[PDB]
């Protein structure tokens, strides 16, 4: 659970299964976390930018992106895209 192929700061096993961000650290998903308001995330372990936007999976999941971006784009599968 320490392999990071794409060097996107999230382990491959964490991306294949669910994962969440606590204290700016990616941790494995437990179901009980959903009761505290945490969201389950999945992304590609071979792509640093799964959605193809200028922000990586860890940047979107952790919230290190510009605060004017909607929270929907915090999911790695939802791209930050202005229309």
């Amino acid at each position: 659970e320490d392999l990071d192929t794409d060097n996107d700061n999230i382990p491959d096993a964490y991306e294949k299964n669910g994962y969440t961000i606590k204290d700016s650290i990616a941790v494995k998903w437990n179901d009980s976390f959903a009761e505290q308001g945490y969201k389950k995330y999945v992304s590609s372990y071979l792509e640093s930018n799964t959605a193809g936007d200028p922000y990586t999976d860890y940047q979107k999941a952790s919230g290190s992106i510009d605060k004017a971006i909607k929270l929907e784009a915090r999911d790695p599968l939802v791209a930050a895209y202005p229309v």
């Binding site: 193809g52 004017a68 909607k70 939802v78």
Partner: protein, 349 residues
Amino acid sequence: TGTAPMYKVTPTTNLVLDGETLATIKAQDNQIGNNLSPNETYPKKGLSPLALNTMDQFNARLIPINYDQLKKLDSGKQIKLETTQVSGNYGTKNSQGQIITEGNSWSNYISQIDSVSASIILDTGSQTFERRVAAKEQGNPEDKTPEITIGEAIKKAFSATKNGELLYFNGIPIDESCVELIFDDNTSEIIKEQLKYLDDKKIYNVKLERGMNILIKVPSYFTNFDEYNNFPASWSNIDTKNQDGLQSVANKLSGETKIIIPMSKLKPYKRYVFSGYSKDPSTSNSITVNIKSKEQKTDYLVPEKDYTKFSYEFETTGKDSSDIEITLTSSGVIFLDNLSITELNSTPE
């Protein structure tokens, strides 16, 4: 109408008059918007629209037209504006901790985002939201993009709330049976095929694929006979003492039902769709559908064992015109639930 703000907005617009493009103008210093947050406008809501009256790079040359175009304008013809492309910047962080937008072009990512994603649009009647959801390549073994269903993609993209088996965007139910779904040919083709191999026939259970185009339209009028009924009039001959409904109760049609839709309650020269859900365990009865509108059409519907959706289109002409009538009659015993009226695109006058 996206998810991220745009900095230094520089749109390009075509001015078209009677099949000819008068000019193609790119925004300059006088027309560049510094900030444009999602669900916002430049200029803001309380301000007047900005003036585009120059065509050169330094805002020093006006936009000319010739004599024939001026005569066409004086004859009643109108100029249309189209948007061809928009330029802008996104924000990043540098080694000094300051936000940098210069040199961060959104055009460097537009093609890549459109190539690997599927487009989902939501139209609640007053607002519009556009989203891109990533999906994997069909034939690539090395693509590790996770697979989610259409409903899961919608919930992820629009931050909808799941209170059980219900989906709410901002208090408006966006369930599969409460909204109108529009696709193109390819999306319709994949969606209908996939369903023919599923225990459920719910489109929201269909796996999302790259290249899909989905449009969700919240209905102008909707009734489920439980708590919501916002039709301009009251439905005639309604049976509410039932428990065989799609969600809570149904409307067992024993006779003829008619509605009166005043023309003032509908937009003129627009195409509307009347939709509903029907069920008949006997699978023997038939329903007659008739709508008095700009043109009156008559159709016959054969229900199935379980609930199925029926939809029929009609048009309107003129604000001060005749009233709108819709009638539904069944020879035997049928069930009706989730009756809705939705507004499609505007037919030209």
